[PDB]
Amino acid sequence: NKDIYQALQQLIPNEKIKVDEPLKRYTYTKTGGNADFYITPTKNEEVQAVVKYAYQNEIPVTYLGNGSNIIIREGGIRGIVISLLSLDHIEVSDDAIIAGSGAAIIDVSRVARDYALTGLEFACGIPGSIGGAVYMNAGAYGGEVKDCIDYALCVNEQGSLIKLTTKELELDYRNSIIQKEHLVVLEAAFTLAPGKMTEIQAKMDDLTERRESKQPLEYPSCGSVFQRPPGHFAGKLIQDSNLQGHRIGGVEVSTKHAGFMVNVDNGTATDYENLIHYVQKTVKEKFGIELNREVRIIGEHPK
Ligand SMILES: Cc1cc2nc3c(=O)[nH]c(=O)nc-3n(C[C@H](O)[C@H](O)[C@H](O)COP(=O)(O)OP(=O)(O)OC[C@H]3O[C@@H](n4cnc5c(N)ncnc54)[C@H](O)[C@@H]3O)c2cc1C
């Protein structure tokens, strides 16, 4: 690894490279082992240089946002982890808004309101970054990143810049082309419609109230873990299986929303995975229905 470190240092400012860095310090779930290399670029060129280098030497690269939609094993991640959290700009021009993939979508949603632009109120409570939102076509309460996005600037695994328009992004229900061909999102552009701020505020206020009353927003958490099985709702099945409150390590099935797994007591990525297995097993026994995992689990098992 000496070799990679030395090489990376030839390509990007040294202080932007952290070695054997515990990811639990940065993930929304507060879990995750060591990242061999944790890079925080402040420019697109730096992302390109790192991706090209990794491609050339076959080093796996993991793109990360706020970690609100993954579970990283306690063994950490082998290779290079690029955090896009510093690519945070948000700029508005009339009805258009551009934002770096590291910017919090909630921050962009709040900028939209500041300019009396309607169309992103649905995102006032979605955790994470713009890059992650694009990756999953994040959506809530009838809204989707897809409603107002024009394009997303990305870097392919070979290190080239590619501007993908709305159609090319192939935004779908909880999916996109970012997933299918491992591109890294650098920036997203939107076009919104002028609106009446008091009305924009009222919608955000209602959606905030609604979500707060239904979700365990006060605990680090991973959101909706399972796919929805035919004829039922995963959270309802889990609840009817009397799994709410069931804990393993420091992670338990939320007593506020059975579809959520909260880190209530310094839990680990291992607890999450174990609890998932246990929930799948308990439900299958009670209803004969098999819940399939929706949230990706990455990284290595410890030891
Ligand atoms: C309490 C709670 C409520 C939630 N509510 C909603 C909701 O209402 N609607 C909804 O859609 N989702 C929801 N989520 C899920 C989550 O917030 C979204 O999926 C979000 O867009 C993830 O952003 P992130 O920065 O946290 O991504 P991460 O968790 O850091 O990563 C997610 C995935 O995207 C990739 N990725 C991350 N950044 C980039 C990038 N720049 N380029 C390429 N790939 C990248 C990663 O490799 C990984 O596969 C909720 C989560 C929680 C904990």
Q: Answer whether 65's CB lies under 8 Å from 84's CB.
A: yes
Does residue 210 line the site of ligand 1, with CB under 6 A? no
- As a whole number of Å, the end-to-end CA separation of the chain is 18
- What whole-number distance in Å separates Cα of residue 283 and Cα of residue 286? 5
Does residue 184 line the site of ligand 1, with CB under 6 A? yes
Residue type at 37 in one-letter notation:
F
**64: CA distance to ligand 1 center in Å?**
9
In sequence order, which residues have a C-beta less than 8 Å from that of residue 36 and are 6 or more positions away? 1, 4, 19, 20, 76, 77, 78, 79, 80, 81
- Choosing from 25, 87, 134, 135 the residue with most ligand 1 atoms within 8 A of its CB, the one to mutate for a pocket test is 135
- What whole-number distance in Å separates Cα of residue 303 and Cα of residue 270? 13
For residue 265, what are its two tokens?
């007591």
Q: Answer whether 42's CB lies under 8 Å from 56's CB.
A: no
Secondary structure in 3-state letters for the chain: CHHHHHHHHHHCCHHHEEEEEEHHHCCCCCCCCEEEEEECCCCHHHHHHHHHHHHHCCCCEEEECCCCCEEECCCCEEEEEEECCCCCCEEEECCEEEEECCCEHHHHHHHHHHCCEECCHHHCCCCCEHHHHHHHCCEECCEEHHHHEEEEEEECCCCCEEEEECCCCCCECCECHHHHCCCEEEEEEEECEECCHHHHHHHHHHHHHHHHHHCCCCCCEECCCECCCCCCCHHHHHHHCCCCCCEECCEEECCCCCCCEEECCCCCHHHHHHHHHHHHHHHHHHHCCCCCECCEEECCCCC
Position in ligand 1 atom list of the atom nearest CA 154: 42
**Active-site residue numbers?**
174, 224, 294
- What whole-number distance in Å separates Cα of residue 199 and Cα of residue 118? 9
Pick from 221, 231, 233, 230: nearest CA to 275: 221
**128: CA distance to ligand 1 center in Å?**
5
In sequence order, which residues have a C-beta less than 8 Å from that of residue 6 and are 6 or more positions away? none
Cα within 13 Å of Cα(150), Cβ side: 10
Strands 77-83 and 61-64: parallel
- What whole-number distance in Å separates Cα of residue 285 and Cα of residue 280? 9
Residue type at 57 in one-letter notation:
N
**297: CA distance to ligand 1 center in Å?**
13
Task: Please tell me the residue having the least CA distance from ligand 1 atom 47.
Answer: 63
Does residue 72 line the site of ligand 1, with CB under 6 A? no
Q: How many CB atoms lie within 10 A of CB 276?
A: 22
Does residue 65 line the site of ligand 1, with CB under 6 A? yes
Does residue 29 line the site of ligand 1, with CB under 6 A? no
Task: Please tell me the residue having the least CA distance from ligand 1 atom 2.
Answer: 223
For residue 33, what are its two tokens?
């082992």
**2: CA distance to ligand 1 center in Å?**
32
Q: Answer whether 251's CB lies under 8 Å from 263's CB.
A: yes
For residue 36, what are its two tokens?
């061999």
Position in ligand 1 atom list of the atom nearest CA 131: 41
Q: How distant, in Å, are the alpha carbons of 16, 84, 135 from that of 32?
A: 20, 17, 20
For residue 136, what are its two tokens?
């999953």
Does residue 41 line the site of ligand 1, with CB under 6 A? no
CA torsion sign for 39, 45, 48, 49 is negative
Domains in the chain: ranges and CATH: 1-88 (3.30.43.10), 89-215 (3.30.465.10), 216-303 (3.90.78.10)
Q: Answer whether 177's CB lies under 8 Å from 170's CB.
A: yes
Does residue 138 line the site of ligand 1, with CB under 6 A? yes
Does residue 259 line the site of ligand 1, with CB under 6 A? no
**133: CA distance to ligand 1 center in Å?**
6
Please, which experimental method was used?
A: X-ray
Q: How distant, in Å, are the alpha carbons of 156, 157, 187 from that of 190?
A: 21, 25, 10
Report the residue count for the chain.
Answer: 303
CA torsion sign for 268, 288, 173, 111 is negative
Q: Answer whether 231's CB lies under 8 Å from 287's CB.
A: no
Task: Please tell me the residue having the least CA distance from ligand 1 atom 51.
Answer: 223
Please compute Rg for the chain using Cα positions.
Answer: 20
Q: Which residues pair with 90 in a beta bridge?
A: 99
In sequence order, which residues have a C-beta less than 8 Å from that of residue 48 and are 6 or more positions away? 155, 159, 160, 161
Does residue 85 line the site of ligand 1, with CB under 6 A? no
Q: Which residues pair with 286 in a beta bridge?
A: none
Backbone angles phi, psi at 129, to 5 degrees: -100, 170
Crossing angle of helices 44-56 and 2-11, in 10° steps, is: 140
